[PDB]
């Protein structure tokens, strides 16, 4: 007698589950279904009524196991001081204007955080969702972490560049960038999330060596997790191996991974007992041109692999079919016999 909620966040602390969960917790807006119930970017972004309606339609459509929000690595980033570029129906936000980029002078987490840019969107869009499919059915909040965080409010070019010859700047943003975190996932989960799923690319060793993630990056990331006030999991995008050990050991109950770094067999070896595996199925090369069984095969082989939640490797993309998506809960139906 598992509910979709339970199941899912005993597949995520590594307790006895009836089956493996199928969802994401990364982005589900797609172009199909934005189509299908009128609820497009970029107003699916500001408005919450629409961004509730095109989750739930990546939910009652899909059979994805899990209702996720928002579409974008913008929100908090921009609710700090970040200009967006709010995007177009296939191409998603993104970061153009950064507010601290040659200094840190005035940089805060401001007194009324939660009130600011879109974070008042997110939070009514998890309601209205909870108010639509009731209390058995998770709700995973998404937010770009606090290194992605960090990295956008001085830009990238000064992070990396902070990171060699300003050791004490590099550290004073991903403090700012780590309380801000913790405020708005917290408030996620006071609005009904169930699970906090950050995305944070920067982390990733194809931008920042991982001796820099052991050094700076890992400390605050784990001060996320324990602050954070329900199951979490941490979504490194890139060829993360050479850190894949180090995440495990950031308190993080999930960790979601690409298709990239190998099978989920070889990660399931490498993270032993520390934290369960969310993926992997390859987003731009199996589920966005499939065919369906190729789909159903690199699905079955994580299943057989041990993946503790079946699940698209990145953010789904936007031109995926609707039966791609399908597919992938076909194939988890279909391990059952
Ligand atoms: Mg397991
Ligand atoms: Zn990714």
């Known amino acids: 007698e598992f509910t979709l909620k339970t199941r899912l966040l005993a597949a995520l602390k590594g307790e006895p589950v009836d089956k493996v969960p199928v969802c994401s917790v990364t982005q589900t807006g797609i172009v199909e279904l934005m189509d299908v119930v009128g609820a497009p970017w970029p107003e699916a972004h500001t408005n919450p009524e629409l961004m509730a309606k095109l989750a739930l339609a990546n939910h009652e459509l899909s059979g994805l196991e899990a209702v996720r929000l928002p579409y974008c690595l913008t929100v908090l980033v921009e609710a700090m001081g970040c200009e967006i570029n709010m995007g177009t129906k296939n191409r998603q936000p993104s970061v153009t204007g950064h ?9 805060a987490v401001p007194a009324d955080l939660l009130q600011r840019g879109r974070i008042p969107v997110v939070l009514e869009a998890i309601k209205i969702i909870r108010e639509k499919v009731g209390p058995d059915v998770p709700i995973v909040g998404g937010m770009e972490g606090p290194v992605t965080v960090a990295s956008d409010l001085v830009s990238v070019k000064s992070f990396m560049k902070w990171s060699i010859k300003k050791t004490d700047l590099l ?54 997790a324990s602050s954070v006030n329900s199951v979490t999991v941490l979504h490194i995008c890139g060829n993360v191996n050479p850190i894949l050990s180090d995440m495990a050991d950031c308190g993080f109950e999930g960790l979601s991974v690409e298709e990239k770094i190998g099978s989920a067999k070889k990660g399931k070896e490498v993270i032993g007992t520390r934290a369960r595996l969310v993926g992997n199925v390859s987003s731009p090369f199996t589920l966005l041109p499939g065919p369906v069984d190729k789909i159903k095969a690199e699905a079955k082989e994580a299943l057989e692999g041990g993946i503790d939640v079946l699940a698209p490797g990145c953010g789904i993309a936007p031109m995926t079919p609707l039966e791609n998506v399908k597919a992938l809960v076909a194939a988890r139906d279909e391990f059952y016999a």
């Not at 507010?99 to 940089?107: R, V």
């Open 99 to 107: 507010p601290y980029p040659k200094d840190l002078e005035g940089a």
């Open 171 to 224: 550290e004073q943003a991903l403090d700012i960038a780590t309380e801000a975190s913790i405020i708005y996932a917290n408030a996620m989960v006071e609005a009904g999330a169930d699970v906090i799923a950050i995305a944070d690319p920067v982390a990733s060793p194809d931008l920042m060596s991982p001796d820099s993630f052991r050094q700076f990056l890992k400390s605050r990331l784990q001060k996320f």
